[PDB]
Amino acid sequence: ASGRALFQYPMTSKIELNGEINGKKFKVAGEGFTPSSGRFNMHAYCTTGDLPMSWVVIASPLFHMFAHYPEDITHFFQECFPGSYTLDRTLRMEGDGTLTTHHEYSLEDGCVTSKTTLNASGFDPKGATMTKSFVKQLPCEVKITPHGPNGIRLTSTVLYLKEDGTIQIGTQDCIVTPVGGRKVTQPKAHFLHVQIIQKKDPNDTRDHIVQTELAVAGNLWHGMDELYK
Numbered sequence: 001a002s003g004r005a006l007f008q009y010p011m012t013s014k015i016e017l018n019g020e021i022n023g024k025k026f027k028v029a030g031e032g033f034t035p036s037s038g039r040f041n042m043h044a045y046c047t048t049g050d051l052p053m054s055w056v057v058i059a060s061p062l063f064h065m066f067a068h069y070p071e072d073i074t075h076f077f078q079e080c081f082p083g084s085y086t087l088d089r090t091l092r093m094e095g096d097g098t099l100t101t102h103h104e105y106s107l108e109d110g111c112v113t114s115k116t117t118l119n120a121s122g123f124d125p126k127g128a129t130m131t132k133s134f135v136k137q138l139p140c141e142v143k144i145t146p147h148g149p150n151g152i153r154l155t156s157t158v159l160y161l162k163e164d165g166t167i168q169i170g171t172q173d174c175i176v177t178p179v180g181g182r183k184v185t186q187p188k189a190h191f192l193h194v195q196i197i198q199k200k201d202p203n204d205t206r207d208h209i210v211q212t213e214l215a216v217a218g219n220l221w222h223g224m225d226e227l228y229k
């Protein structure tokens with residue numbers, strides 16, 4: 001049993017995330033549900049006190065293996081199992097700061113655990129990330145291409161909405177590397193539509209978020225694949 005046969009729904013998730021931003025160290029944990037292909041939630045909480053940054057900016061750090069793929073695009077993230085992959089991200093909040101994250105994953109008993117680290121240095125202390133002035137990030141199209149002999153790369157430019165109704169841009173790039181000691185067949189160039197919605201739990205006493213992601217792959221520009229050898 002490998003690849004897509006390992007991703008029979010429903011499934012669940014866990015996260016452990018160790019972070020630091022501008023010298024403030026913090027931890028997040030969470031549990032989540034994946035009811036069906038491409039719809040996945042995560043109820044996360046800060047275990048060290050209040051989260052020292054926007055929940056909206058930490059959203060993308062908070063599981064591409066749950067994306068919904070049609071049959072005729074390789075689901076690279078799922079095809080990495082067994083063996084797993086790492087994800088290394090850079091998120092440049094333009095005029096504000098840059099963060100990186102590193103993610104390792106394991107699958108057991110229908111549950112994907114993410115163990116993530118986040119490092120962020122040089123953020124503007126009065127910017128929207130540190131003062132928590134963001135409301136949401138708008139849905140994006142993530143460009144996915146083959147990268148090196150055995151990886152993929154993901155890129156997006158994301159609009160973050162502030163409380164005053166104006167926008168800040170994040171520029172984001174990820175590299176996915178199989179760690180399972182084997183070759184995984186790369187997909188053709190394609191795109192992932194990503195929508196992230198956040199709400200609070202009516203009762204939870206912790207600093208937390210209840211997040212849902214919809215992620216759907218599609219060959220949005222058929223000609224793109226020609227450009228990536």
Ligand SMILES: [Cl-]
Pocket residue numbers: 053054055056132
């Ligand atoms: Cl927030």
Ligand SMILES: [Cl-]
Pocket residue numbers: 072073074186187188
């Ligand atoms: Cl493909």
